[PDB]
Amino acid sequence: TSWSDRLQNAADMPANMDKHALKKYRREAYHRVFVNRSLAMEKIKCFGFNMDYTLAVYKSPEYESLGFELTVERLVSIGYPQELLSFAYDSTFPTRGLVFDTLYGNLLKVDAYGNLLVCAHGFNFIRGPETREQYPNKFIQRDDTERFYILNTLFNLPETYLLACLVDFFTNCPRYTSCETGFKDGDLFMSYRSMFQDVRDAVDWVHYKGSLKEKTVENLEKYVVKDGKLPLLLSRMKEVGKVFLATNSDYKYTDKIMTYLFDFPHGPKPGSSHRPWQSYFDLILVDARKPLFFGEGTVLRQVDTKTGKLKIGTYTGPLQHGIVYSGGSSDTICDLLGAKGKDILYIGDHIFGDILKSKKRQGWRTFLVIPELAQELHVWTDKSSLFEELQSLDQRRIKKVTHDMDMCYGMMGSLFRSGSRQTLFASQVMRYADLYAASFINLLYYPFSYLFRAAHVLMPHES
Amino acid sequence: TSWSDRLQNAADMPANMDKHALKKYRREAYHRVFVNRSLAMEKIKCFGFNMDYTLAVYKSPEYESLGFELTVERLVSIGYPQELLSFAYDSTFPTRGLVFDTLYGNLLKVDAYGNLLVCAHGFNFIRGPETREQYPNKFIQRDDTERFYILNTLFNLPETYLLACLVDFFTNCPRYTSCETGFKDGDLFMSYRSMFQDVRDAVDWVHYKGSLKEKTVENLEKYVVKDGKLPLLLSRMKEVGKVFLATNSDYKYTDKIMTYLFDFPHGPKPGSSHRPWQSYFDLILVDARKPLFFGEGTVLRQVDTKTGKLKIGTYTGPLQHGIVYSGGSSDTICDLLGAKGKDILYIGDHIFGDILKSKKRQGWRTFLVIPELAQELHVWTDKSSLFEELQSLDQRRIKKVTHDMDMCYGMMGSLFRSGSRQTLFASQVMRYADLYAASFINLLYYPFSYLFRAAHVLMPHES
Numbered sequence: 029t030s031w032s033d034r035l036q037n038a039a040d041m042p043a044n045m046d047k048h049a050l051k052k053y054r055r056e057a058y059h060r061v062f063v064n065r066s067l068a069m070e071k072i073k074c075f076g077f078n079m080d081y082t083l084a085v086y087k088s089p090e091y092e093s094l095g096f097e098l099t100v101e102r103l104v105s106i107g108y109p110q111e112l113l114s115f116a117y118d119s120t121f122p123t124r125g126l127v128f129d130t131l132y133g134n135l136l137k138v139d140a141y142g143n144l145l146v147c148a149h150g151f152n153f154i155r156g157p158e159t160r161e162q163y164p165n166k167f168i169q170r171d172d173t174e175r176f177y178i179l180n181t182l183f184n185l186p187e188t189y190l191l192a193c194l195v196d197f198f199t200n201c202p203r204y205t206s207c208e209t210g211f212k213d214g215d216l217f218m219s220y221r222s223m224f225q226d227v228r229d230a231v232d233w234v235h236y237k238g239s240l241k242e243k244t245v246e247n248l249e250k251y252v253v254k255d256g257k258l259p260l261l262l263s264r265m266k267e268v269g270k271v272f273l274a275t276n277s278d279y280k281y282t283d284k285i286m287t288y289l290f291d292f293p294h295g296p297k298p299g300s301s302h303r304p305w306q307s308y309f310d311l312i313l314v315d316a317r318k319p320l321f322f323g324e325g326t327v328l329r330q331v332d333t334k335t336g337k338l339k340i341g342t343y344t345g346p347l348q349h350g351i352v353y354s355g356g357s358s359d360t361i362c363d364l365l366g367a368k369g370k371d372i373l374y375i376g377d378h379i380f381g382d383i384l385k386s387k388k389r390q391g392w393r394t395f396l397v398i399p400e401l402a403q404e405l406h407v408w409t410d411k412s413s414l415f416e417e418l419q420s421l422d423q424r425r426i427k428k429v430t431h432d433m434d435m436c437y438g439m440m441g442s443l444f445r446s447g448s449r450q451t452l453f454a455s456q457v458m459r460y461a462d463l464y465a466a467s468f469i470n471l472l473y474y475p476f477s478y479l480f481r482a483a484h485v486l487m488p489h490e491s
Numbered sequence: 492t493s494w495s496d497r498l499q500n501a502a503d504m505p506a507n508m509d510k511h512a513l514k515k516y517r518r519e520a521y522h523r524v525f526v527n528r529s530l531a532m533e534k535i536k537c538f539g540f541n542m543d544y545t546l547a548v549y550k551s552p553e554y555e556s557l558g559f560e561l562t563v564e565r566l567v568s569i570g571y572p573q574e575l576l577s578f579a580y581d582s583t584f585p586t587r588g589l590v591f592d593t594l595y596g597n598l599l600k601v602d603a604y605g606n607l608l609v610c611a612h613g614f615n616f617i618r619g620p621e622t623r624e625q626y627p628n629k630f631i632q633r634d635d636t637e638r639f640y641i642l643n644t645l646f647n648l649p650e651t652y653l654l655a656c657l658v659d660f661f662t663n664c665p666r667y668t669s670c671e672t673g674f675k676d677g678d679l680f681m682s683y684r685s686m687f688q689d690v691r692d693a694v695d696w697v698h699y700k701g702s703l704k705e706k707t708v709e710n711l712e713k714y715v716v717k718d719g720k721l722p723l724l725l726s727r728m729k730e731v732g733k734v735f736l737a738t739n740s741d742y743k744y745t746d747k748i749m750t751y752l753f754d755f756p757h758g759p760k761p762g763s764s765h766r767p768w769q770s771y772f773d774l775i776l777v778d779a780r781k782p783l784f785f786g787e788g789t790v791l792r793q794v795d796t797k798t799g800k801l802k803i804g805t806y807t808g809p810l811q812h813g814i815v816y817s818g819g820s821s822d823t824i825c826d827l828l829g830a831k832g833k834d835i836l837y838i839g840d841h842i843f844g845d846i847l848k849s850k851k852r853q854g855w856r857t858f859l860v861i862p863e864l865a866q867e868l869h870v871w872t873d874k875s876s877l878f879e880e881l882q883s884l885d886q887r888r889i890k891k892v893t894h895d896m897d898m899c900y901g902m903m904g905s906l907f908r909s910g911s912r913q914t915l916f917a918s919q920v921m922r923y924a925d926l927y928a929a930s931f932i933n934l935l936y937y938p939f940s941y942l943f944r945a946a947h948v949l950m951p952h953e954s
């Protein structure tokens with residue numbers, strides 16, 4: 029039972045829109061919208077969406093496995109050893125939001141301050157005392173973004189596991205000698221840094237020049253969660269505001285995926301005529317290049333929707349019906365929709381590129397979709413007696429229970445914590461996502477003008 | 492009754508070290524250490540101090556007035572009009588942590604997200620609707636550190652008030668024409684940006700080449716809070732750990748100020764021999780250049796304590812008794828004291844340069860001294876019925892009460908909030924200062940191995 033299984037189960041349910049059934053549905057944590065900072069929905073004039081892992085949620089572990097296989101095949105084709113071909117994706121190893129340290133080849137789970145919560149070299153979990161050889165203060169400098177790479181997205185799950193696989197492989201293969209910062213193979217030295225760059229380049233290649241998109245599209249049911257409730261929610265949003273799409277992907281892929289997401293024998297609800305996905309949006313923008321999009325962005329272009337190619341030149345004209353934009357900046361959306369940032373609720377899955385950057389750079393209201401929350405709530409609920417025991421105790425009893433708690437989620441523990449310690453991801457969700465949920469669909473269960481409320485915060489001296 | 496009056500009152504009290512009197516004293520908010528993140532004092536091996544506004548707390552409003560007069564005199568001497576000479580410091584205008592917008596000439600009080608809480612152009616407080624002409628989203632981009640200057644320290648109070656004075660003066664003087672981004676004087680255009688740079692340069696000059704230090708030292712009782720309890724606390728810290736000083740000031744000034752702070756007819760307690768201030772520190776470091784100090788720093792130098800000049804060359808030797816260092820980096824302290832960052836509690840008043848940077852860059856434990864908390868607690872306590880009314884209501888009743896609440900603190904409101912909205916300063920204290928208090932002296936009231944406890948934080952879905 030993966031998190032995507034939970035999501036597809038809820039996707040298969042039709043919307044009962046009776047005002048009392050709606051209120052009772054959003055009782056269950058799976059269907060709730062969680063609130064970090066208060067948000068009056070009545071004040072939202074534009075709803076903005078990301079596509080990948082927001083509107084288009086890819087099924088797990090099938091899609092991660094596909095990305096993993098194609099990345100591995102790319103590395104073998106550029107010269108990596110044949111043994112890579114015997115790796116197989118394991119969804120129980122990676123948790124999202126890990127930090128790869130390119131100096132020492134470790135995956136790290138850290139808190140908001142760079143304190144080490146978990147350290148794995150290959151599949152070898154480094155316990156407290158031994159991590160002090162490499163991390164004397166059990167701490168990393170987060171501002172050292174050249175050394176440390178944060179694996180923010182579900183697209184990073186395959187490389188998270190692959191990095192550990194590769195480190196495990198070269199360490200244990202007797203054709204290589206292990207050094208502090210990489211591997212010797214006779215007269216060739218491969219640093220963990222160049223190994224990571226090869227993996228990163230290979231993932232990029234698979235997305236950009238490889239066959240991931242082609243393979244996805246030739247089996248959409250296998251790879252993509254589909255929900256009849258999506259057209260209904262979008263169409264209700266359009267009744268009270270403007271709706272826009274801003275994706276880092278290209279038009280041709282967006283068009284294939286979005287057509288699939290709206291492919292039902294009806295429109296917003298059963299019995300209504302089907303309408304093209306594009307009709308649900310006041311503005312469609314592809315090749316966004318987020319987060320640069322929230323800074324200077326790039327030159328605004330117009331897509332030729334017939335050929336899927338860009339028209340030559342910068343687009344200088346106004347918003348017209350049926351136009352599709354490419355590139356531009358968040359100011360494009362504001363200018364064209366007549367919107368200020370706080371009038372916008374932007375719904376995304378990328379904590380850095382969608383959420384943190386739109387908040388800091390533009391003062392947009394934010395909604396973070398966390399697909400794994402589907403499963404994480406189940407574990408949180410039915411394993412709460414473990415956490416409660418931990419909360420009670422607050423020494424090597426603490427270490428044992430922290431471990432058992434964590435193991436329930438996988439080898440790298442919960443997305444949100446290690447025992448009583450919150451992860452960097454958890455703190456960034458709290459700091460930057462005004463609202464969050466397992467799915468944006470949970471907005472369907474809240475009335476037109478709901479007021480999401482979070483308690484006022486007091487400083488220690490104010491209590 | 493200024494905040495420094497409150498502090499000097501407590502300074503005049505002798506330490507009653509009876510274990511029950513200590514426990515009862517730290518009941519009162521004035522004498523408490525507040526806790527943002529848990530800290531086991533037993534784990535602290537080195538206590539580090541800043542000098543200015545930490546150990547040496549300058550009396551208010553006398554010291555701010557002195558800085559203000561000397562800055563004004565510097566501006567007049569470089570060509571600013573004679574009318575500046577009739578300005579007089581007003582301690583009721585500035586609150587610390589305001590943001591000067593160099594584009595439009597406004598002082599802004601903002602929250603952690605760049606949302607506008609207060610906007611003053613000169614002495615003209617811009618209400619909601621009118622701020623939208625210049626701030627369409629009632630929001631500033633905090634990452635635009637070229638446009639926005641955050642007035643973090645008590646040293647910035649004189650320029651905070653002076654900036655408002657200057658904008659008020661040129662606006663109302665008919666020899667100048669007001670434009671969006673500054674003032675016309677015939678064929679001369681002075682932008683608010685160049686005006687701010689002149690003020691900034693003039694403050695720097697007063698500190699570096701002017702007579703502020705000379706004037707301070709020729710009247711120390713007038714300008715500097717003195718406390719018999721300081722030698723006692725330092726000497727108790729030295730019993731269980733190492734103690735160090737890291738100041739951005741120069742040796743000669745540090746030596747004058749520190750001699751004064753320890754000038755009592757006794758040592759740690761009445762009846763004990765007086766000892767030189769330097770004897771209380773295992774390591775003394777001047778010209779620190781914080782926050783650069785917490786990055787690459789500068790070359791480590793040795794002070795010639797006879798002449799007050801630097802010895803020629805980089806100091807390559809070991810920690811020796813009686814040596815005084817200059818420049819260097821935070822790694823100097825760790826290497827010389829055999830300390831890891833989490834073994835260090837660093838006590839400072841600069842939220843950015845002492846606290847935020849030592850936390851993020853080095854994983855130091857942090858203690859923020861907030862001198863105004865002395866007065867702010869009094870207002871918080873005896874005006875709590877106003878805040879409580881506000882908390883109850885949570886529309887133009889909200890606006891009225893927010894205003895009346897704020898006015899109790901001064902024209903720019905509390906350091907920590909505007910009504911129910913927390914300031915950027917408040918959020919940075921919570922995020923970056925593990926402990927905080929009105930004075931570092933409050934540590935005297937806590938046992939050798941106290942455990943400061945903050946409640947574990949839960950995400951909305953975890954509650």
Ligand SMILES: Nc1ncnc2c1ncn2[C@@H]1O[C@H](COP(=O)(O)OP(=O)(O)OP(=O)(O)OP(=O)(O)OC[C@H]2O[C@@H](n3cnc4c(N)ncnc43)[C@H](O)[C@@H]2O)[C@@H](O)[C@H]1O
Nearest residue numbers: 170171178180379380388633634636641643842843851919
């Ligand atoms: N998940 C992720 N994956 C990959 N990368 C990620 C990531 N999350 C974050 N990053 C990037 O990692 C680097 C370090 O991250 P962080 O350490 O997270 O920077 P921050 O979250 O924004 O904290 P800070 O309180 O200083 O920020 P603020 O907006 O207040 O500061 C705004 C500006 O004002 C300055 N500033 C802030 N407070 C100040 C003060 N009190 N005085 C003077 N200057 C101040 C700051 O130095 C800054 O220049 C950054 O480049 C960040 O964008």
Ligand SMILES: Nc1nc2c(ncn2[C@@H]2O[C@H](COP(=O)(O)O)[C@@H](O)[C@H]2O)c(=O)[nH]1
Nearest residue numbers: 078079080183231232235236275276277278
């Ligand atoms: N080149 C590259 N593209 C990525 C990577 N991760 C996600 N993408 C692309 O980002 C797009 C998703 O954008 P979204 O709709 O989420 O803004 C997809 O086209 C996907 O292929 C990556 O690691 N490298």
Ligand SMILES: Nc1nc2c(ncn2[C@@H]2O[C@H](COP(=O)(O)O)[C@@H](O)[C@H]2O)c(=O)[nH]1
Nearest residue numbers: 541542543646694695698699738739740741
């Ligand atoms: N040049 C300059 N020096 C300052 C300014 N503010 C504080 N200082 C200096 O900083 C030193 C205080 O450093 P601390 O002991 O607080 O680290 C003092 O010498 C003081 O003159 C400023 O705005 N400009």
Ligand SMILES: [Mg+2]
Nearest residue numbers: 078080081377
């Ligand atoms: Mg996405």
Ligand SMILES: [Mg+2]
Nearest residue numbers: 541543544840
């Ligand atoms: Mg200081």
